[PDB]
């Protein structure tokens, strides 16, 4: 019975595989199968999850007990969720049981097969939903009506069915049997801290295969909320979320509505904030979270990639642009320097999962332009001492994307890029640039002033700057 940190005892993990021979010895050794796990499970609850009728035989011989864990699910409903009708048959044959969970399990059992990713059955969908429904109307004295749930754009304004006549009339439409099942799962498991995300992903993935992209987006939208109620990281859901747009936008199916993208980005706004807030929660443990944090940062670019391609009235971008400045004012700080403007211009190598294509290109002209259109800080400097123009000159294949290389420099000289800048080891823009043709364009855009490089003479002499210069001018010594 001495268990792990998650309170899984030795015999808890024995029944996990299903080898009844070991369990047969264990129970005959006067060991209790009803020890509670970290959530509160028991060997019977594991047997309910495992669904091995062989092991349960010894369990019934040694009178295991029913325990509800911290998630709030009965083992009888666990067999219903596990889609083990035979184990349901045995437990319905069990001497001690509560009919309250039986109806609750059977309704979820019917919704279990309909929403099942691999073992889906529409025959078991109607057969067990009807049997459970008749259990509600088994008695005329007590009339149990399946409570309806509020209509949802994700749910397409559907209410939970209340009578067999509704169930009998909808045996024809397979999706209606699919569609009703989600309401049953949502209504019952809402109180429990138990996710229902897996069915919705299955529904959307099939809809993704059925060109029903309108429904899958909205279904996942609520599934985005379902992850939020459970305080469960949506970044993995967001990881696949972006990749969905990655295909069909390339296929140019429909790019009609960017106002939805506002909802998507407003959704990931606090997610990154929470991701940033998670970074505030832990310091050493967020080492791997940085990559996920970087991934969220990458999604920003990919979202911008979508945002760049989609076009609409300026008001939508006004909705979009507001939260952008939030990200701007929020710290974009990244390790080894490399803020977003640094990462937007350089070779954005961490791209994959169909993002290594024309949708997300390394030279990205407009995205860098639009970042400045948002109004970020032009003169940010990396810990290496690098500038915005310190990277664009360090560009291979100048002939390739020649117009883009020219176009970026057009805006960068505007909005205040200091023409020649040296930090740490001396790095003039002429020095960092290694391609002659690029340097020519740099020569074309120079503007001659007096102090902008006259001060540089003082470093050759290096007299005491402090207490000899106005307050604001002291940095020009520092810059050079």
């Amino acid at each position: 019975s001495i268990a792990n940190k998650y309170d899984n005892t030795c015999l808890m993990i024995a029944a996990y595989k299903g080898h009844t021979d070991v369990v047969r010895y264990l129970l005959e050794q006067r060991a209790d199968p009803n020890a509670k796990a970290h959530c509160g499970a028991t060997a019977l609850h594991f047997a309910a999850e495992a669904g091995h009728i062989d092991i349960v035989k010894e369990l019934i011989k040694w009178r295991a007990a029913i325990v509800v864990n911290g998630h709030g699910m009965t083992p009888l409903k666990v067999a219903a969720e596990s889609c083990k009708a035979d184990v349901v048959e045995l437990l319905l044959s069990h001497a001690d049981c509560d009919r309250r969970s039986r109806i609750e399990a059977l309704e979820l059992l019917g919704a279990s097969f309909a929403n099942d990713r691999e073992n889906y059955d529409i025959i078991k969908t109607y057969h067990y939903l009807y049997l459970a429904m008749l259990e509600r109307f088994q008695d005329g004295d007590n009339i149990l009506e399946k409570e309806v749930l509020p209509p949802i754009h994700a749910y397409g304004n559907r209410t939970e069915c209340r009578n067999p006549q509704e169930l009998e009339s909808i045996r024809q439409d397979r999706d209606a049997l699919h569609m009703e099942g989600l309401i049953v799962r949502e209504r019952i498991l809402g109180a429990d801290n138990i996710d229902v995300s897996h069915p919705i992903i299955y529904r959307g993935a099939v809809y993704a295969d059925n060109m029903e992209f309108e429904q899958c987006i909205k279904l996942w939208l609520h599934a985005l909320h379902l992850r939020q109620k459970g305080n469960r990281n949506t970044h993995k859901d967001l990881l696949r979320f972006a990749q969905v747009f990655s295909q069909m936008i390339h296929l140019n199916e429909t790019v009609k509505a960017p106002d939805i993208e506002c909802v998507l980005r407003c959704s990931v706004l606090e997610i990154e904030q929470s991701m940033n807030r998670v970074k505030n929660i832990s310091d050493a443990d967020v080492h791997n979270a940085m990559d996920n944090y970087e991934c969220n940062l990458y999604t920003f670019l990919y979202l911008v990639c979508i945002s760049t391609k989609t076009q609409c009235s300026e008001e939508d971008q006004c909705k979009i642009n507001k939260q952008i400045y939030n990200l701007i004012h929020l710290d974009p700080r990244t390790r080894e320097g490399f803020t977003l403007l640094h990462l937007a211009v350089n070779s954005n190598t961490p791209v994959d999962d169909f993002h290594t294509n024309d949708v997300c290109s390394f030279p990205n002209a407009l995205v860098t332009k639009l970042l400045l259109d948002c109004g970020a800080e032009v003169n940010a400097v990396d810990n290496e001492g690098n500038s915005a123009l310190h990277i664009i000159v360090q560009y291979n294949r100048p002939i390739s994307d020649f117009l883009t290389l020219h176009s970026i420099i057009i805006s960068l000289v505007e909005a205040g890029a200091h023409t020649d800048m040296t930090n740490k080891q001396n790095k003039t823009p002429l020095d960092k640039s290694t391609t002659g043709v690029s340097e020519i364009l740099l020569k074309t855009q120079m503007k001659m002033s007096l102090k902008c490089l006259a001060a540089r003479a003082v470093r050759a002499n290096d007299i005491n700057y402090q207490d000899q210069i106005p307050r604001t001018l002291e940095e020009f010594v520092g810059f050079h």
């Binding site: 792990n4 940190k5 998650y6 899984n8 808890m12 993990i13 996990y16 796990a37 970290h38 959530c39 499970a41 594991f46 999850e49 864990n69 998630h71 138990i194 996710d195 993935a205 993704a208 295969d209 993995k236 696949r240």
Partner: peptide
């Protein structure tokens, strides 16, 4: 042609809904 998430079960926390 369309892949699926691994959803590999953590051996220590055997409960499906509770994952790390």
């Amino acid at each position: 042609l369309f892949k699926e998430s691994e959803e590999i079960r953590t051996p220590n926390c055997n409960c499906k809904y509770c994952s790390h």
